[PDB]
Paper text:
The ethylene-forming enzyme (EFE) catalyzes two main reactions: the conversion of 2-oxoglutarate (2OG) to ethylene plus CO2 and the oxidative decarboxylation of 2OG coupled to the C5 hydroxylation of l-arginine (l-Arg). EFE also facilitates two minor reactions: the uncoupled oxidative decarboxylation of 2OG and the generation of 3-hydroxypropionate (3HP) from 2OG. To better understand the evolution of this enzyme’s diverse activities, we demonstrated that two distantly related extant enzymes produce trace levels of ethylene and 3HP, and we examined the reactivities of 11 reconstructed ancestors. The structure of one ancestral protein was resolved by X-ray crystallography, while the others were modeled with AlphaFold2.
The [name] protein is a monomer in solution, however the asymmetric unit contains two molecules (chains A and B) with an overall Cα RMSD of 0.2 Å. The [name] protein structure includes a double-stranded β-helix (DSBH, also known as the jellyroll or cupin fold) core, an architecture that is widely found in members of the Fe­(II)/2OG-dependent oxygenases. The metal-binding site of the [name] protein resembles what is found in most other Fe­(II)/2OG-dependent oxygenases, with the metal coordinated by His200 and Asp202, that derive from the loop linking β5 and β6, along with His257 that is situated at the N-terminus of β10. An overlap between PK2 EFE·Mn­(II)·2OG·l-Arg and [name]·Mn­(II) shows a Cα RMSD of 1.4 Å and reveals that Fe and 2OG binding residues for this ancestor match the situation for PK2 EFE. Similarly, the [name] residues maintain much of the hydrophobic environment of the 2OG binding pocket, although Pro93, Phe175, and Ala279 in PK2 EFE are replaced by Lys100, Tyr185, and Ser269 of the [name] protein. In contrast, however, there are large differences in the l-Arg binding site. Of greater significance, the l-Arg binding residue Arg316 of PK2 EFE aligns with Lys323 in the [name] protein. The [name] loop between β7 and β8, spanning residues 220 to 226 (shown in yellow), is significantly shorter than the PK2 EFE β11 loop, residues 209 to 237 (shown in red). The greatly shortened loop and changes at the l-Arg binding site of the [name] protein compared to PK2 EFE explain why the enzyme is essentially inactive. The crystallographically resolved structure of [name] reveals only small differences in the 2OG binding pocket but large differences from PK2 EFE in the l-Arg binding site, accounting for its depressed activity levels.
Residue numbers in the entry: 8 to 192, 199 to 221, 224 to 260, 264 to 291, 305 to 328
Amino acid sequence: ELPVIDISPLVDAPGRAEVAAQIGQACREHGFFYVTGHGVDPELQDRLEALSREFFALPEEEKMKIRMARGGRAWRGYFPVGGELTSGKPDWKEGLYFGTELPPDHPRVRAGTPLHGRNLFPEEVPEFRETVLEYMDAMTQLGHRLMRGIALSLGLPADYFRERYTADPTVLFRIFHYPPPPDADEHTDYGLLTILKQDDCGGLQVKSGGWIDAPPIPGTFVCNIGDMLDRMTGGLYRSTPHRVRGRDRLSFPFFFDPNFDAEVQPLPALDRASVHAFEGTYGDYLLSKVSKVFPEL
Ligand SMILES: [Mn+2]
């Protein structure tokens, strides 16, 4: 049975010892887990999906007004079919790249740090901007709470992450649209935690040994472990190998990752061994992976 964890105690409810234990079991046995009781408003989620379908149904020429080339070093905007390079060929996939909304007078923008700056939003869906940023705020708060549960599940103090790597976290948010195939015909996330919202007719899969379906479950987010959490636990919490295998699907992966300048180190007690070998900051690490998916910029 797939692990579905009620995380209400980490959100708005009285404490329950079993929550941290269940998170630990899920990371050790499965590498991923569903969460319920996350506190993210369902109407906000429904409005994010509705405004997303509205955007992807626009004409291509309108969608390309917020194409990623206009996002600059901030790494934001729209990509059409073929716009992402995965498995060595342009992907039959379109989507949207978002990150923290930073004003131009923010020090990171004034320093010209890659992956920092403003998001792009379409003139044609005027209420999309507010919905997206409210969702990112809700998910950023959920991320911090889930890292506490992850800390507890390792026998650590609950604020272990907040005090070292995630006080000022790297938050990345994408909206992916998979059209039905034109004809009839594996990876790991790089940060700490992926919090994924799936649509109902979603088709996601995760490894085990065996590829298993991680079907959509109402009221849940699917969470999995990233390369940096793998590194920090010396491989105890294994970064989750997954893939998307039909018709028209939307998905909304949210990534809760370390500070851009954080050097995530293995716990001394688990440091017995990319990933475990990598010298540099999370920003260095993230930047290398971004250079491969978009050779443009
Ligand atoms: Mn992924």
